[PDB]
Design a protein around this ligand. Structure first.
Ligand SMILES: *CC[C@H](OP(*)(=O)O)[C@H](O)COP(=O)(O)O
Ligand SMILES: [Mg+2]
Length: 324
DNA sequence: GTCGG
DNA sequence: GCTGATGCGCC
DNA sequence: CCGACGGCGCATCAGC
């Protein structure tokens, strides 16, 4: 795209701040500045020009000015040549290894995947799985597979109980050619916010999907949400499919469609819809949609039976998952 | 790092 | 054995 | 000039 050099620089600076410096806000800033520049329909000639965009401040401008003039950034070259920084930045790619564990490993002389395999005793359950499917988790999922994966989930959910309502959200629901992982939202007439659940409602779906050898491993499981690994059935004639990340979140029926809206995305869209709601005098979150009183106090949660209901409440024209 | 009170 | 703090991850 | 910038489910560990 236009200004591929500047965006890469910023995204590289962002990763450094998150993984090495452990400054989450600086990371979010550099990410913000990188995204707005990526959409920009020109080629930035000066830092003063880039500063006119929202999220680009004084310091990023003086960075853009340096990059365009010199070709490479003085700071990043210092980070690139640093053994500790680059090593810490690598390990954080492994699922279960955040900045904290990463630094702890590199300080103890563990820098590469070879070292992680050699020292599996020092890894937790999550990190072991993160290492096992390291390459597989960095592969994107083509829509062709996601469709085949969906059919298995929805049918196997139907196999346990007909009353279950399974909805695959994320990029896939917006109709993207490729998706990062599978994000499934589950609910049942039995489960609501007021009247609590008898457990083994999510479990039965997870236990069923394991029975048909779809779910391979488990990263985390509890009452509400589950996180683990799944694999499509080997065609036998062809080579086996790569392992994929799956998430199954069990949500109360009354606040399902409020959940479906939030987990459908995108971030920019939710941020714009939530911003408009405040202008119209309503407050929406992951869970519920509520009215803001005269004094600016949230009332009782309003009834919702679809996504349309939320769009109606804030007198907004219904947008299809394609245009999110 | 950038924004807004 | 319990309860709170903290790392990690989602968009 | 200075505080906000994501609140939460689950796994793990510290402290009692
Ligand atoms: C690149 C500009 C940085 O500003 P921030 O608000 O993190 C630094 O202040 C410049 O110093 P460097 O990081 O040592 O180059
Ligand atoms: Mg600006």
């Amino acid at each position: 795209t236009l200004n591929g050099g500047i965006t890469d620089m910023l995204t590289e600076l962002a990763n450094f701040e998150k993984n090495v410096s452990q400054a989450i806000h600086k990371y979010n800033a550099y990410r913000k500045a990188a995204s707005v520049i990526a959409k920009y329909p020109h080629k930035i000639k000066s830092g003063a020009e880039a500063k006119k965009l929202p999220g680009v401040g004084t310091k990023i401008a003086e960075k853009i000015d340096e990059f365009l003039a010199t070709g490479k950034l003085r700071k990043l070259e210092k980070i690139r040549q640093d053994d500790t920084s680059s090593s810490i930045n690598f390990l954080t790619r492994v699922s279960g290894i955040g900045p904290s564990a990463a630094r702890k490993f590199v300080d103890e002389g563990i820098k590469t995947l070879e070292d992680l395999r050699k020292n599996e005793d020092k890894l937790n359950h999550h990190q072991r799985i993160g290492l096992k499917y390291f390459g597989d988790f960095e592969k994107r999922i083509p829509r062709e597979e996601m469709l085949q994966m969906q059919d298995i989930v929805l049918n196997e959910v139907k196999k346990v109980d007909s009353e279950y309502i399974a909805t695959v959200c994320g990029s896939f629901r917006r109709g993207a050619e490729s998706s990062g992982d599978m994000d499934v939202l589950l609910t049942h007439p039995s489960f609501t916010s007021e009247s609590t659940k008898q457990p083994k409602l999510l479990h039965q779906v997870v236990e069923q999907l394991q029975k048909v050898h779809f779910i391979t491993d488990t990263l985390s499981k509890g009452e509400t949400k589950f996180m683990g690994v799944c694999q499509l059935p080997s065609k036998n004639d062809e080579k086996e499919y790569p392992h994929r990340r799956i998430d199954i979140r069990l949500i109360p029926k009354d606040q399902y469609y409020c959940g479906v809206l939030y987990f459908t995305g995108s971030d920019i869209f939710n941020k714009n819809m939530r911003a408009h709601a405040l202008e119209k005098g309503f407050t929406i979150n992951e869970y519920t949609i509520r009215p803001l009183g005269v004094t600016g106090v949230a009332g009782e949660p309003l009834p919702v039976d679809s996504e349309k209901d939320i769009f109606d409440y804030i007198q907004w024209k219904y947008r299809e998952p394609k245009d999110r």
